[PDB]
Amino acid sequence: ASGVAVSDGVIKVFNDMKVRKSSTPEEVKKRKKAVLFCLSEDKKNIILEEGKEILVGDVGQTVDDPYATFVKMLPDKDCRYALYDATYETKESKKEDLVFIFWAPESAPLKSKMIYASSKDAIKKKLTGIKHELQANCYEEVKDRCTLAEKLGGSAVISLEGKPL
Amino acid sequence: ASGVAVSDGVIKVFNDMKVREVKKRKKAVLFCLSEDKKNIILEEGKEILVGDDPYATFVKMLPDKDCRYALYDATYETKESKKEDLVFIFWAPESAPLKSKMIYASSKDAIKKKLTGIKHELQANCYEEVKDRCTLAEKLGGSAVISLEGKPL
Amino acid sequence: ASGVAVSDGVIKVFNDMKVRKSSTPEEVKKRKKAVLFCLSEDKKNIILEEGKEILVGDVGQTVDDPYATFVKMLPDKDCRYALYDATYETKESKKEDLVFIFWAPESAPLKSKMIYASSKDAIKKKLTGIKHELQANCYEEVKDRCTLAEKLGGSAVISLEGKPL
Amino acid sequence: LKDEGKLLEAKGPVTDVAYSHDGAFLAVCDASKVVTVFSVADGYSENNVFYGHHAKIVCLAWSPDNEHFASGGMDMMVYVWTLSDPETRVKIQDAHRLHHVSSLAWLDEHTLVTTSHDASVKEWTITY
Amino acid sequence: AALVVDNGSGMCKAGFAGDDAPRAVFPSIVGRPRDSYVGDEAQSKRGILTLKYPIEHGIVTNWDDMEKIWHHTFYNELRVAPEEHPVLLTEAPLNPKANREKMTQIMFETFNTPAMYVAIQAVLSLYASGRTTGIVMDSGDGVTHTVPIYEGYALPHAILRLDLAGRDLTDYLMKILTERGYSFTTTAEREIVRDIKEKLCYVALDFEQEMATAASSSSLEKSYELPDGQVITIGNERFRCPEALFQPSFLGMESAGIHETTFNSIMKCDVDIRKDLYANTVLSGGTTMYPGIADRMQKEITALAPSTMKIKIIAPPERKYSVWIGGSILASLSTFQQMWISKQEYDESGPSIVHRKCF
Amino acid sequence: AALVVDNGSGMCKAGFAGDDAPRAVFPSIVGRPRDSYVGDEAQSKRGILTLKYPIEHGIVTNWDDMEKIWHHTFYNELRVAPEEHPVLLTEAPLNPKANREKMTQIMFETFNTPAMYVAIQAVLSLYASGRTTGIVMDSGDGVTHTVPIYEGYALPHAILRLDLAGRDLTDYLMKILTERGYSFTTTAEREIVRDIKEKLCYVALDFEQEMATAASSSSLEKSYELPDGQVITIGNERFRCPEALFQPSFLGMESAGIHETTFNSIMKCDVDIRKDLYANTVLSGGTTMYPGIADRMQKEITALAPSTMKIKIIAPPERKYSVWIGGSILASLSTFQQMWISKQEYDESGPSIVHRKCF
Amino acid sequence: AALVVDNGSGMCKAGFAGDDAPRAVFPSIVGRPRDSYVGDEAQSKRGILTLKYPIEHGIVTNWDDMEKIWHHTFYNELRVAPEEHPVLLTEAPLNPKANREKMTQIMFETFNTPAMYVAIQAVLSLYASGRTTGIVMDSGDGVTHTVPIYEGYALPHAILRLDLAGRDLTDYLMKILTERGYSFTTTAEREIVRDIKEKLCYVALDFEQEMATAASSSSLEKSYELPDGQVITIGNERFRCPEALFQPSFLGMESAGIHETTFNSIMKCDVDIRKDLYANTVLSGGTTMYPGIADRMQKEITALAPSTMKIKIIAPPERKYSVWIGGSILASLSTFQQMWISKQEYDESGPSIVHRKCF
Ligand SMILES: Nc1ncnc2c1ncn2[C@@H]1O[C@H](COP(=O)(O)OP(=O)(O)O)[C@@H](O)[C@H]1O
Ligand SMILES: Nc1ncnc2c1ncn2[C@@H]1O[C@H](COP(=O)(O)OP(=O)(O)O)[C@@H](O)[C@H]1O
Ligand SMILES: Nc1ncnc2c1ncn2[C@@H]1O[C@H](COP(=O)(O)OP(=O)(O)O)[C@@H](O)[C@H]1O
Ligand SMILES: [Mg+2]
Ligand SMILES: [Mg+2]
Ligand SMILES: [Mg+2]
Structure with a gap:
């Protein structure tokens, strides 16, 4: 336990992103499909990465593949927390679940990896109600669209984000 | 209960058919949901006049992939007496889509209970169940019926 | 299944002890109230104990409590088969039933305990028509007059051998 | 309360007991369709036994004149008993139809109030 | 000494003439594997064998199975030889004449009984209450019978049979006890529920009023201890289970209640005798032993009865075994020894002798 | 948009009206330490906590845990606020009326749902098959129900409840898989056995002939890969596990099989309607998804039924979620918007409005 | 004379009928190079070879090594020819029927035994205590079994198997002895730790109080002499090692303790026989030989069973070999010689004769 606390701006983002309240169609487009969390400059709080977010409106018009675009947002030399709203489909149902991605590449400095890993359980206990978690330590572990499918359902998942696997 | 409303023309048609000119009396009639699926309307060109095998030309009138309601004025002669009673027929083929089967089944009591006095209901879920002349006789009077539609059984 | 057979003397005694046929009052006193069975010296048959029996005539004249003196006949270092003709009374009926008691104290030698327990199913199936069975493995389990009452009818039994519980 | 060791006997399970207004008589009704009156003055001994109910008696009341009492039963009948003469009684048949009189009381020596499970209260003028 | 056997739909009561209570009361079942267990032996084996009722509604259906119950009765229960004691038997109302000839045949040939009756x-219960004219409501285990009797002669045209009885009440209590989370499914657990029914259930005078008051009643809740030490708690099911006697819709049945069945049979008699039947309604049977069932019956019948008519429901304290006790008293009388069907008379006349001597 | 929630005995199926399949299917369990984890969280939390079913046999016994499951359903599974969407709920056959009102009260007072139904x-499964009269054999996780329905009205006197269902089959497969040397004991390993049951198990038309086939060859053997990569083989256990449905004696149970329970409930109805019930036997539930179960049910019922009767077993391909699919189709109809129970109607007639509006 | 062979999960007991003790007690292992060494010879090579158990949890997994163990039993341990003496064999509860036929086929064809049984x-342990009804908690080397037996017939649906046994206790003691600084890792040092377990370990009545007692005094410490002369001291590990029986969480297992497994199997039986099982709990096996285990078992089951129930744990002083002693007495009876399966009987019927003669 490093002691890093989750900021109120991250908890509010998670609450809005988790429960989908009835809203106007122009307000549905402002929902977040993916969002990145980082550490503050003093490394005391987990804050939001400004500009590192994917809106639902962008998906399908600007963002053709939400997962491919989200992966490119991950830094290549730094650790990051992520919240991806995966829309998949199994052989029996169509599901829409939140995924907690812990990005920690081997290329990241050792200082960042220790702080992010030690405080990972502290942030995830505040983000109550999330079941799927992806721990990625390499680009290949997160670039592949399949690796999410095994985490989501396994072999049951037949489609992901509207595209067959 | 689906909540659909039975059309008022269905009740009048049943009332005319229940009581007993002859050349205009209906022997069979089909009922269907409207295009918006909120009314049990009467099919315009799917009916049989008394003046016009009456049961054969009625079964072939049933669609092969959609559910329907029907009202047949089946006539039969038992050993003791000869009688004619209306039969409510719920045609629901297995090949029909899932939504059509559910809406027709959940709204069947809406129309059947509006036609008070009906005593016979035939639930045909396949063509072999409606073409079968024996089961209709059993529904009417069981072993009492010996001849149906003027022909021996 | 030790293969020990039941002697014809035991079966004859049981048949007389079960069915009560009409007889002279001097013949009713010769009925057996409780009878003890044991293994032969060759351990091949379940013979009848010579003097270990209680007659109905002795009850009320010499034997004040038929059950109390019956327990005194059970050896404290050997296993026995017993047949007690309990005459209890419930809140709705006055009953007279046969009880099969398998005496097997923990102080008995293991050779006796093994043969008696293994051959019990053979003798019990030959004594057709018996419903109650008391499995006693210590003096405390059989000395108490109550332990018969729970086995006989349970809490419904209000009298046992003509006396209230 | 000290048990005096006195056991008055009825004909069945006691359903209601009522002392007289002057305390000179105790009337006991039971499920055996019998009303027994005990004279308090003379050693709590039985005074009279009243017959006529054909079902379990459920209620009893003493008239203010201390000479009459009324009992209602599950036979849907109410009897007003003369204490002196057990052979004279007033038969109020079906005071509340289809319902037994659950409770009853006297407004005065000539008015009898009866209630039942039909949630209605009735007053009757009793003439001897 | 003579033997008295009361063959019931669910229980067989047997004993000796002159006794106050039957010596043996065991279930009238014959079990066979899923070699043959009869009586309480079948109950002690449960799932290994299949249970069947030869007498299920008072009338014998399997004469082969009822022979084994009779053999179990004489040798295992009464522990006497049937050939040495005369036997008094009881038959259900509206018993077919063929069954009467079969019953008298089995006793004399299979069991070699010296005398029989x-x-x-129904008439045994009415006689035991000191009555000769009246209507007897015999609610047993598998069948409820309302038998109007006029000077000792049961009126066959007015006898009504209701299949609602104690057996259905046990199943109803079994079903509504699962609403509290208790699992009573196996055969052995069914006799446990029957014990709860016979100890904690009662009939309410007004079901709607009882349901309202029992919501906040501190005395309604009762605790029952299972044979294995577990404790179950029963609440408003105490008066809900016997309410199905008067409201068969609780069981899904469309039949009338016991109060209406009793009223229907009275209305099937002559207007001359209906006055005596209303004043002599005798309750008999195990299912009539609920506390408060006589008060409820009087209230319900009075509603159906004409305006000016005396309704008297008779519930003697010994009505549970009134059939047997009446038979035991009758068989023990010295003047009754001439009314036995002797074995010699059987050979001369055959099975038809029962129709003349036993009437 | 309306919500359709199918409160199963072991699995809760929830989704939105108009969808082809439920969005969320999670276990109906509430786990507490040996603070409170509901659903898949209790499964994926090690064997450090006790698991409890609020619904275990179709009837809600613990209403405090039921609210936890419903709260988990709307917020964690459906990810919606119940105060903004009407909710359609499903109830088991023979559900007590008090439980029906309690469900209505919780939705309107604890969750503040604008509308509710x-x-x-059973009737949702029958309607989805295009039928109004028939018998539904709904075999789920913790309970099996045979519900005879005639003209849209279920017959309460003939509904039979069977405790044998998929949960007992999963435990049976665990027991018989240890015979091959595969130790499945933990909660995590129980879910693996359930996957084996749902992928490799089938019902044999002739059990005794199939057992000889398995013992004389290896064509019936199949391989299953465990989550950690180990491959296990399963032979005659493929058809032995679902055979307990037709032979409950494999589990030590007293009750009859699903084929005999269906036959017993049919014979508990009127003779005029038994012919229609025999030809309209509809299968529903997860436990009815074994391949070859309709052929086995057809053969077994034909043996019990009279030879003159025609037996037809209906096994629609969507029967696994036929209850939910029917509710979703019904709740999405434009005419159903007037069939809901509003909040305004609730706080004018109380929980008793559910008996008038619905049912 | 006749041979009695009690092939256990970790130890093989063999001898002659009529003897008070088994002549040969050797480990049931077969060693192969890392040609083939069986029993004590395999233990004498340690890490040179690899050790496997043909019987590991009661049932035989590899029948090829079992034949070598039986061959070692007759010629090397018993020093007799199996073709001249009938052999009595013992089988674990819930043994598959196929294994029973394989066992008798090997005896008659490979070893040419004249007779077998x-x-x-479990029934041998119960009979040796003078009981026909009760529950036997057989805790051995590789597996623990709770077998409820009624009237000499074990109830298969209630038999519970727990993989925690003496083998897991030896490994746990090895693990916790290293905390004091004693390195016990090799095969040779494992047999030393087994000796420490069998001489210095005991079950504490109150584990938490006893744990605090050891932390404040040296009264619980004991000294043990290694084979080569060093003396090691053991303190609170004396009661920690067998505490894993009642708290399997010490070993990382999610299963319940032996007290809970016994209670769970009793609650899986019929309610009318649970009272008899509570007062007839018989302990058998080597792992039940710890001092103070009967007192701890009684205390733990009392807290689980209803307060009205009477709990009696039977721990005979000879429970370590009660299975073999019961078999030796049974086979030595002169009236048992007709219960053997003769070679002539085997030829006529085949391996299936065992299911009838041996039941
Ligand atoms: N004391 C009781 N209170 C309430 N119900 C009872 C009582 N005793 C028996 N019952 C029921 O009465 C039934 C048996 O009574 P019985 O008169 O012998 O019927 P039958 O002779 O037809 O078998 C049983 O179902 C039993 O449960
Ligand atoms: N495809 C399948 N094949 C065989 N059994 C299945 C299959 N799917 C589910 N089952 C069983 O069905 C059970 C749950 O199904 P369900 O009908 O939803 O029961 P419930 O209504 O009680 O929730 C589970 O125990 C599962 O193991
Ligand atoms: N005297 C003892 N005290 C405590 N544990 C013992 C004792 N004797 C043996 N054990 C353990 O019991 C195990 C073997 O006992 P056993 O009953 O023969 O099992 P199995 O049936 O598998 O042969 C061994 O692991 C041994 O360590
Ligand atoms: Mg009777
Ligand atoms: Mg379901
Ligand atoms: Mg062993």
């Missing part, structure tokens, strides 16, 4: 169950 | 699971 | 281990 067959009596109507 | 209750439907019977 | 197969007996259940």
